[PDB]
DNA sequence: CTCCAGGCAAC
RNA sequence: UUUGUUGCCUGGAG
């Protein structure tokens, strides 16, 4: 059966290689991903037989406080490298059980389904005429999943009694705070390999309820949004779905994140819209500011690495960042930020030549006319003031940086579009 | 299509 | 320090 299908050698080996490639910090027994192969070889005959007998209880998850981009504290649950391996072996077998019957409008944590599909369908509804959105998010979503309602939904397709006892055992296994087990009443661990799938199993009935209601929607994780023709119809369905998820699935709504507002005034998965009739996708103001804050720390303030290294470090971030944010339809702001990136990268190049004699030595070697070299080498202006001056743009502008190995932001934006 | 070193994003 | 999933991307062994 399913526990036998989970404990199959090929399914365990692929699950092992995942946590190995993850390189995640150890659980509460302190054993690392590096020791994971050596640890299971010694403890396998026990682990295998003790969970075959239904006597196996997993070790508690490690509490780690990480800050969220919103500001608040996110509590993580880090399982034992074995407890991460076992959950993986459960996930790998539970995906073909649950995934095909998941919603067409479900996009979160799913194989072959991305954030772009969630936005393309989202712009496709407002383009059709549904020019109002009911954006919704859930209060501490992974912390608030009810154990009884969840395994009710797990038992719907899974008939094997041994795995239902095993998943419950993982859910019931507590946390370690000051060397003591702290039993869990509600919540699936924020860091359990299986836990993102269990999140989709619970809210599949919410998907089924919305599909029965005949509503045009997009869901990614707990961040769900329904696309309506009007503000009156949106406000109406804002309360009736809140009542549904609070009663039938027992979940609390984050009212600070949830709104009935216009799609272009709100952000969805790092993207926003334009007030146009056929609405174009734009960068959300949070996503622009997260980029700008990252470039400020990547470019040298009082930092000390090699500049050819720095250019490559800027390269790997920007080219990756544009890989996700290729979906935006406004290249104008993308043209500005690349110019801003060049402008910011000019600042740390200007301070590198600290001496006035080195300033003249390099600018004359670059090709710039002596008339302009001596005019700006001994200037009294500030460091950020000098980076916008006509002469520093001539010696060190667009043509210089591209020759120095800086990969252009806009060039690869159109390359990924083509 | 599977796996390895790394990176970007969403959650 | 910092976990997990999912998508994509650069390079590599098949
Ligand atoms: N880095 C992560 N690692 C593991 N799980 C994560 C991570 N980020 C998000 N999740 C999971 C747990 C969250 O409950 C769920 C939905 O994300 P999100 O709404 O941002 O957080 P949240 O619901 O815990 O907080 P909030 O109460 O502030 O809305 O996705
Ligand atoms: Mg939430």
* CA A6 – CA A11 distance, rounded (Å): 6
Are both A136 and A163 inside the same structural domain?
no
A244 annotated to bind ligand: no
> Residue A193: which nucleotide is closest by CA–C1'?
C4
Q: Which of A254, A278, A302 is the last residue of a domain?
A: A278
Q: Which residue range forms the structural domain that includes residue A269?
A: 103-145+187-278
Are both A119 and A63 inside the same structural domain?
no
Are both A323 and A263 inside the same structural domain?
no
- Give the method of determination: X-ray
Are both A377 and A392 inside the same structural domain?
yes
CB-based contact A329:A281 (threshold 8 Å): yes
Are both A241 and A380 inside the same structural domain?
no
Strand B contacted by A400 CB (< 7 A): no
Are both A202 and A347 inside the same structural domain?
no
Q: What is the resolution of this structure in A?
A: 3.4
Q: Residues within 5 Å of ion ligand 2 by Cβ? A: A 137-138, 141, 222
A148 annotated to bind ligand: no
CA angle A233, A236, A239 (to 5 degrees): 145
Question: Strand C: which positions are within 7 A of a protein CB?
Answer: 1-9
Are both A5 and A77 inside the same structural domain?
yes
A254 annotated to bind ligand: yes
> Residue A196: which nucleotide is closest by CA–C1'?
C5
- The total of structural domains in chain A comes to 3
Ligand 1 pocket test: which of A74, A135, A252, A257 has the largest number of ligand atoms within 8 Å of its C-beta?
Answer: A74
Nearest-CA neighbor of A122 among A329, A280, A245? A280
Q: Which of A252, A278, A304 is the last residue of a domain?
A: A278
Q: What is the CATH number of the domain that holds A244?
A: 3.30.70.270
Are both A336 and A405 inside the same structural domain?
yes
Are both A223 and A322 inside the same structural domain?
no
Q: Which of A228, A248, A278 is the last residue of a domain?
A: A278
Quick one: three-class SS letters along chain A?
A: CHHHHHCCHHHHHHHHHHHHHHCCCCCCCCCCCCCHHHHHHHHHHHHHHHHHCCCCCCCCEEEEEEECCCCCEEEEEECCHHHHHHHHHHHHHHHHHHHHHCCCCECCCCCCCCHHHHHHHHHHHHHHCCCEEEEECECCHHHCCEHHHHHHHHCCCCCCHHHHHHHHHHHHCCEECCCCEECCCECCCCCCCCHHHHHHHHCHHHHHHHHHCCCEEEEECCEEEEEECCHHHHHHHHHHHHHHHHHCCCCCECCCCCECCCCCCCCECCEEECCCCCCCEEECHHHHHHHHHHHHHHCCCCCCCCHHHHHHHHHHHHHHHHHHHHHCCCHHHHHHHHHHHHHHHHHHHHHHCCCHHHHHHHHHHHCCCHHHHHHHHCCCCCHHHHCCCHHHHHHCCHHHHHHCCCCCHHHHHHHHHC
Span from the CA of A141 to the centroid of ligand 1 (angstroms): 7
Are both A334 and A367 inside the same structural domain?
yes
Are both A242 and A326 inside the same structural domain?
no
Strand B contacted by A412 CB (< 7 A): no
Are both A7 and A47 inside the same structural domain?
yes
- Rounded alpha-carbon distances, angstroms, from residue A287 to A184, A265, A269, A322, A335: 35, 14, 9, 11, 16
Strand C contacted by A95 CB (< 7 A): yes
């Amino acid at each position: 059966a399913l526990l036998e299908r989970i404990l199959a050698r090929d399914n365990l080996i692929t699950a092992l290689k995942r946590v190995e490639a993850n390189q995640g910090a150890p659980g509460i027994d302190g054993v690392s991903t590096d020791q994971l192969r050596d640890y299971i070889r010694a403890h396998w005959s026990t682990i295998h037989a003790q969970l075959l007998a239904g006597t196996y209880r997993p070790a508690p998850v490690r509490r780690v406080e990480i800050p969220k981009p919103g500001g608040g504290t996110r509590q993580l649950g880090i399982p034992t490298v074995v407890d991460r391996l076992i959950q993986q072996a459960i996930l790998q077998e539970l995906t073909p059980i649950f995934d095909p019957d998941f919603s067409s409008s479900s996009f979160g944590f799913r194989p072959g389904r991305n954030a772009h599909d969630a936005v393309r369908q989202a712009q496709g509804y407002i383009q059709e005429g549904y020019r109002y959105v009911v954006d919704m998010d859930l209060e501490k979503f992974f912390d608030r999943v009810n154990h009884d309602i969840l395994m009710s939904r797990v038992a719907r397709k899974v008939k094997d009694k041994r795995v239902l006892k095993l998943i419950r055992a993982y859910l019931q296994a507590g946390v370690m705070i000051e060397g003591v087990k702290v039993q869990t009443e509600e919540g699936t661990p924020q860091g359990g390999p299986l836990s993102p799938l269990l999140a989709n199993i619970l809210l599949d009935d919410l998907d089924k309820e919305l599909e029965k209601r005949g509503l045009k929607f997009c869901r990614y994780a707990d961040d769900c949004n329904i696309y309506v023709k009007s503000l009156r119809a949106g406000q109406r369905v804002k309360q009736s779905i809140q009542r549904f998820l609070e009663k039938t699935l027992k979940l609390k709504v984050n009212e600070e994140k949830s709104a009935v507002d216009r799609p272009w005034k709100r952000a969805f998965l790092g993207f926003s819209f334009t007030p146009e009739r056929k609405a174009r996708i734009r960068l959300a103001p949070r996503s622009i500011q997260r980029l700008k804050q990252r470039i400020r720390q990547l470019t040298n303030p009082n930092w000390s690495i090699s500049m050819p290294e720095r250019i490559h470090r800027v390269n790997q971030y920007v080219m990756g960042w544009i890989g996700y944010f290729r979906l935006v339809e406004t290249p104008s702001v993308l043209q500005t930020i690349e110019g801003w990136i060049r402008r910011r990268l000019r600042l740390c190049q200007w301070l590198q030549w600290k001496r006035v004699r080195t300033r003249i030595r390099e600018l004359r070697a670059l090709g710039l006319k002596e008339t302009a070299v001596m005019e700006i080498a001994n200037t009294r202006k500030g460091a950020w003031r000098t980076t916008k001056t006509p002469q520093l743009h001539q010696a060190l502008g667009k043509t210089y940086w591209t020759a120095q190995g800086l990969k252009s932001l806009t060039q690869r934006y159109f390359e990924l579009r083509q």
